[PDB]
């Protein structure tokens, strides 16, 4: 999930936008 | 800003700034 992709590992804009509505 | 380890409130604020008026969903347990 988002914690695995952005917290435990380095986040990116590509991944963050996957969570916008 | 975006290219780093973002956890907790820090991650929540990043989503807020990036998504803007589209909003977003935060599911830490998934």
From Swiss-Prot, chain A:
Domain of life assignment: Eukaryota
UniProt feature coiled coil, ranges: none
Name recorded for this polypeptide: Insulin A chain
Location of this fragment in the whole protein: 88 to 108 of 108
Disulfide bonds: 6-11
Lineage: Eukaryota, Metazoa, Chordata, Craniata, Vertebrata
């Amino acid at each position: 999930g988002i914690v695995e992709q952005c917290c435990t590992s380095i986040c990116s804009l590509y991944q963050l936008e996957n969570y916008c509505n | 800003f975006v290219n780093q380890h973002l956890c907790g409130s820090h991650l929540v604020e990043a989503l807020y700034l990036v998504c803007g008026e589209r909003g977003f969903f935060y599911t830490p347990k998934a």
